């Protein structure tokens, strides 16, 4: 699977470390393009980083800090487009991967494939084992029209570096080896030539091409300046509709495509909103509704009527810079059937800002969210009031799409709680992202949950630690109920089943439906039990009703 997604956790220490590595190994294991900030921080030394080994592109910045590994195998790293940049400057920054007072610490960049740095500068400081980082002609990397050609570099180490490779032309090298040799492609090139494969002219790369080539064509390119149109690094993916130049009726253009980040695709991928105007997003353009389309797609179409009112979460609109839910915003969410944005409950949710006479959130207030079905963002909990034994004010929460993810990576997080079981019964889709569930001392009925069906993509996985030991969990007796199919439940009893063994009577699982004996004869429908019409006489044993409405019964 080519495309993964960045993190966005900066230099901030990983909440659950014992998980953290296994977070990285999931995010990118299989990954080629990385729409956004490749962040590899805090990693200690016993740490096999063999999943990055596939990554070409990186749209974001590339942050490397406070690690300890002597080496990070980012060896195939073609181009880093600095779309967003670290500290709004550096499309790459390697910081303090030295030791917290022979030794550990990052030693060689080995970036022997990094041709282009489309935007932003470079910042490589305080890595007391790092060599040959000055020894790079950084000016060949930066794009031509890179007007962010700024660089700061530390050379101080406690270690004395070795000579480069003999097999290296200049003293220039990424690493001591001979394949680790800086291979230039802008300065050592022929004329106007942005990118080329040798001093010769014929060695020039295409203009649409962008990080060198193996030929004169766009279909010979090492990267793309605008969009990989199915192998032909272009300027513009063919739009969805063409014009007669004269009249101007535009019947659709069959061989048109969709700009996916840096790509040119026919069908915007899973969690992504295909558009009228031809993009893929996770926010529809203004004056658009997010429909649910004549297929299965999400889609972003217009608004005839001034569009109908819509709920917003944290990191969206007036709530954008808000971080937690408090008493002073909790009411906005009443009535909300689908929250655009995200909700998060930090421990300041539950003791308010006395600095601002903001009352602490009371556990009766949460009883707003039972009306909520679909979160388009993340869900993050770290305090939940001591009482409420379960996350069930979201009992009706059906899907979490995670087109925002907490700390970059996590669509559903749960830490330092004290609930005794989950309770999201209705939760079927975990659209994207990883679920992190750690340090809830009393948390059982996690194992009991079949995550593998919530999830939507292979890179996805539930990671968890420091919870309540799932062997001590049948130790007090806790386990799914008999009416919960395939052994799968979200908590005790047949409310928290995942699929009912036989039928549903509302929110409770049952063995069968009163077609024959129960206090009112019912009729079965989508394995739901529903009542017939009260005036359809009770039959002394046999079938009574035959449907919900007034007629289809007896008398």
């Amino acid at each position, epitope marked *: 699977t080519q495309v993964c997604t960045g993190t966005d956790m900066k230099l901030r220490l990983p909440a659950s470390p014992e998980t953290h590595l296994d977070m990285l190994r999931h995010l990118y294991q299989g990954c080629q393009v990385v729409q956004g900030n490749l962040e590899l921080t805090y990693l200690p030394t016993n740490a096999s980083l063999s999943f990055l080994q596939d990554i070409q592109e990186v749209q974001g910045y590339v942050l490397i800090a406070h690690n300890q590994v002597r080496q990070v195998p980012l060896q195939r790293l073609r181009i880093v487009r600095g779309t967003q940049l670290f500290e709004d400057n550096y499309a790459l920054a390697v910081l303090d991967n030295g030791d917290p007072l022979s030794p550990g610490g990052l030693r060689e960049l080995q970036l022997r494939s990094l041709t282009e740095i489309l935007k932003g500068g470079v910042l490589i400081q305080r890595n007391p084992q790092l060599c040959y980082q000055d020894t790079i002609l950084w000016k060949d990397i930066f794009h031509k029209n890179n007007q962010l050609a700024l660089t700061l570099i530390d050379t101080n180490r406690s270690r004395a570096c070795h000579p480069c490779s003999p097999m290296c032309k200049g003293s220039r090298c990424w690493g001591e080896s001979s394949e680790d040799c800086q291979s230039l492609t802008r300065t050592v090139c022929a004329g106007g030539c942005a990118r080329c494969k040798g001093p010769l002219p014929t060695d020039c790369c295409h203009e649409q091409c962008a990080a060198g080539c193996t030929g004169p064509k766009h279909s010979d390119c090492l990267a793309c300046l605008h969009f990989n149109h199915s192998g032909i690094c272009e300027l513009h993916c063919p739009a969805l509709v063409t014009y007669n130049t004269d009249t101007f009726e535009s019947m659709p253009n069959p061989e048109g495509r969709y700009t996916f980040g840096a790509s040119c695709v026919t069908a915007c991928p899973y969690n992504y909103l295909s558009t009228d105007v031809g993009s893929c997003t996770l926010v529809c353009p203004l004056h658009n509704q997010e429909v649910t389309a004549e297929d299965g797609t999400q889609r972003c179409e217009k608004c005839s009527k001034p569009c109908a009112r819509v709920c917003y979460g944290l990191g969206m609109e007036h709530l954008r810079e808000v971080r937690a839910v408090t008493s002073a915003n909790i009411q906005e969410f009443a009535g909300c059937k689908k929250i655009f944005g995200s909700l998060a409950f930090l421990p300041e949710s539950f003791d308010g800002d006395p*600095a601002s006479n903001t009352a602490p959130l009371q556990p009766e207030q949460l009883q707003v969210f039972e009306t909520l079905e679909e979160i388009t963002g993340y869900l993050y909990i770290s305090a939940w009031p*001591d009482s409420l034994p379960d996350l069930s004010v979201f009992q009706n929460l059906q899907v979490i799409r995670g087109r925002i993810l907490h700390n970059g990576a996590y669509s559903l997080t749960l830490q330092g709680l004290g609930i005794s079981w989950l309770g999201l019964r209705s939760l079927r889709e975990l659209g994207s992202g990883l679920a992190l569930i750690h340090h809830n001392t009393h948390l059982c009925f996690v194992h009991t949950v079949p995550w593998d069906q919530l999830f939507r993509n292979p890179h996805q996985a539930l990671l968890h630690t420091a919870n309540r030991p799932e062997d001590e969990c049948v130790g007090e007796g806790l386990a799914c109920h008999q009416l919960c199919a395939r052994g799968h439940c979200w908590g005790p009893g047949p409310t928290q089943c995942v699929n009912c063994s036989q039928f549903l009577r509302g929110q409770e699982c049952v063995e069968e439906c009163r077609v024959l004996q129960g206090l009112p004869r019912e009729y079965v429908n989508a394995r739901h039990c529903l009542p017939c019409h009260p005036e359809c006489q009770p039959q002394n044993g046999s079938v009574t009703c035959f449907g919900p409405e007034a007629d289809q019964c007896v008398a």
Partner: antibody
Amino acid sequence: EVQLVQSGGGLKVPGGSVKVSCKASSYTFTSYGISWVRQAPGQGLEWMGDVNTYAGNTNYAQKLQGRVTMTTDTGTSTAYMELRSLRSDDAAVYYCARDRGYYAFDIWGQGTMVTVSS
Amino acid sequence: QSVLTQPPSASGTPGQTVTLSCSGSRTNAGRDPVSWYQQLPGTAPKLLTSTAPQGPSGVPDRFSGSKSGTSSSLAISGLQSGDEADYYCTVWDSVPGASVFGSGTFLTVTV
């Protein structure tokens, strides 16, 4: 074990300053506040000010305004009691504390030794 | 917003059921701002009850506070041998909010 550790425990001449340290560990520093409180000998408690870890905002009490600056240090995780224009009155013990929950102050640095006399 | 502790000193022998007070100077929250502390001689004060009737973790069940109108009341089941300390409360309502002049108990081993 979550912790707060305090330093600066010294002596001072009236009309000087001190900036007490408070290195907080073993918990996401940014997602709780941090507060300071003082305790002269024989007497009792008295609250200094607030300090949302996440975003700086403050609430230095009345008896001390303009004489106090409190500062977070996210990068390194420390809170600082920058106290000014002190005197004999201002000789006390300056504890630092968070407020997990659910509302008061739970974890407590040992407090520091601050005495003024010329 | 403010309070007063009576007494600044109550004494106690083992097995006994104790009481300490605090008078909230306004209809505080609401309910649940108040919290009591334990102060060992020459060491850091630590929280005992908060939300009035709720122990934290690492503070024992012979501890349990309460409230009534604008007054709070800490309670000890049977007193023990380590409970030599001064006890403070707080109405953590608005800001700025106040502490108290301190109810401090001691272990009466034959006056």
